[PDB]
């Protein structure tokens, strides 16, 4: 659990877990290159405990905009959908957060566990980029946040032959616009 700890005068905030780390005879605490205390020996049981930050995993929130909906989807980066409740400490969270720790709409992506978005097999142009080829949109399946693999474009097979050529019989004059910044406010 996320707790304020005080071991032999050394204080801090974090989650205390059983450690497989081995300590020298008189060592009381362990630190990493960052100088973060990652481990401590309990002065009463002599057991080595790992100290993890209360929130080290990255959490991304996907929204179609507050003007469009208050519905949101949550991406837990590099976390498996089974480990999300432990990774984010859902028992210490509000009932409102616990709704995004589990659910029927849980999809595993290479970017992490996405909760709150319905996964579809249909391919569309990317609207809200999530990562690893996955994008989200506020489509109507009531509108709901939907996650899908982004489309790369329409398929087209050229009929190649050693004795055939396609020649245009007509043309179209097209006018396109190109917008380019030239200056900024002085």
Partner 1 sequence: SAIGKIQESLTSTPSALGKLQDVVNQNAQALNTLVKQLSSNFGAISSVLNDIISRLDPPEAEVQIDRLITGRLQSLQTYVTQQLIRAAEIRASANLAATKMSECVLGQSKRVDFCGKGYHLMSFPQAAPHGVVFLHVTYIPSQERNFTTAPAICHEGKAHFPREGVFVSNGTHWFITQRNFYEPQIITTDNTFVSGTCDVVIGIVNNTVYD
Partner 2 sequence: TSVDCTMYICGDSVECSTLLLQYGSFCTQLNRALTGIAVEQDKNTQEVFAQVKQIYKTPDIKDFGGFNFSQILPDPSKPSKRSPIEDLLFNKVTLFVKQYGDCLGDIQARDLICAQKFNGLTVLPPLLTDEMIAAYTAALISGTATAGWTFGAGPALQIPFPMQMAYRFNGIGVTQNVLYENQKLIANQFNSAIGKIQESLTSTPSALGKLQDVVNQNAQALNTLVKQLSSNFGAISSVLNDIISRLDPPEAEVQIDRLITGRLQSLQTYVTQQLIRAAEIRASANLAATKMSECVLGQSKRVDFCGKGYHLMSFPQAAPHGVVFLHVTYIPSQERN
Partner 3 sequence: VSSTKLNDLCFTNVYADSFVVRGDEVRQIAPGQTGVIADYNYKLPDDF
Ligand X SMILES: *[C@@H]1O[C@H](CO)[C@@H](O[C@@H]2O[C@H](CO)[C@@H](O)[C@H](O)[C@H]2NC(C)=O)[C@H](O)[C@H]1NC(C)=O
Q: Confirm or reject binding of residue 156 to partner 1 (CB under 8 A).
A: no
From the list 4-12, 96-104, 136-144, 176-184, the region that binds partner 2 by CB under 8 A is 4-12
Q: Confirm or reject binding of residue 152 to partner 2 (CB under 8 A).
A: yes
| Beta carbons of 28 and 39 less than 8 angstroms apart | no
Q: Confirm or reject binding of residue 173 to partner 1 (CB under 8 A).
A: yes
Regarding beta strands 106-109 and 10-18, do their DSSP bridges make them parallel or antiparallel, or are they unpaired? unpaired
Binding site for ligand X (CB under 6 A): 44-46
Binding site for partner 3 (CB under 8 A): 6, 8-9, 11
- Residue 92: what are its φ and ψ, rounded to 5°? -90, 5
Cβ neighbours of residue 75 closer than 8 Å, sequence gap 6 or more? 59, 60, 61, 62, 109, 111, 112, 113, 114, 130
User: 118: buried, middle or exposed (CB in 10 Å: 19+, 13-18, 0-12)?
Assistant: middle
The residue among 46 and 180 lying less far from partner 1, judged by its C-beta, is: 180
The residue among 43 and 153 lying less far from ligand X, judged by its C-beta, is: 43
Cα–Cα distances in angstroms (integers) from residue 68 to residues 47, 143, 154, in the given order: 53, 10, 30
**Least separation in angstroms between CB 28 and partner 1:** 33
**Least separation in angstroms between CB 32 and partner 3:** 22
Q: Confirm or reject binding of residue 158 to partner 2 (CB under 8 A).
A: yes
The residue among 111 and 145 lying less far from partner 2, judged by its C-beta, is: 111
Q: What is the largest CA-CA distance in the chain?
A: 90
Scan residues 97-126 and list those touching partner 2 (CB under 8 A). Answer: 110-111, 126
Residues forming the site for partner 1 (CB under 8 A): 162-185
């Amino acid at each position: 659990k996320c707790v304020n700890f005080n071991f032999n005068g050394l204080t801090g905030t974090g989650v205390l877990t059983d450690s497989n780390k081995k300590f020298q005879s008189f060592q009381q605490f362990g630190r990493d290159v960052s100088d973060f205390t990652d481990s401590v020996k309990d002065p009463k049981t002599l057991e080595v405990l790992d100290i993890t930050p209360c929130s080290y995993g990255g959490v991304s929130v996907i929204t179609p905009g507050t003007n469009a909906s208050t519905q949101v989807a949550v991406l837990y980066q590099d976390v498996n959908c089974t480990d999300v409740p432990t990774a984010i400490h859902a028992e210490q969270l509000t009932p409102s957060w616990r709704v995004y720790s589990t659910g029927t709409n849980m999809f595993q992506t290479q970017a992490g566990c996405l909760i709150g978005a319905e996964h579809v097999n249909n391919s569309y142009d990317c609207d809200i980029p999530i990562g690893a080829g996955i994008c989200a949109t506020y489509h109507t399946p009531n509108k709901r946040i939907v996650a899908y693999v982004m489309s790369l474009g329409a398929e087209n097979s050229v009929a190649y032959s050693n004795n055939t050529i396609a020649i245009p019989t007509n043309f179209t004059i097209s006018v396109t616009t190109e917008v380019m910044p030239v200056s900024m406010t002085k």
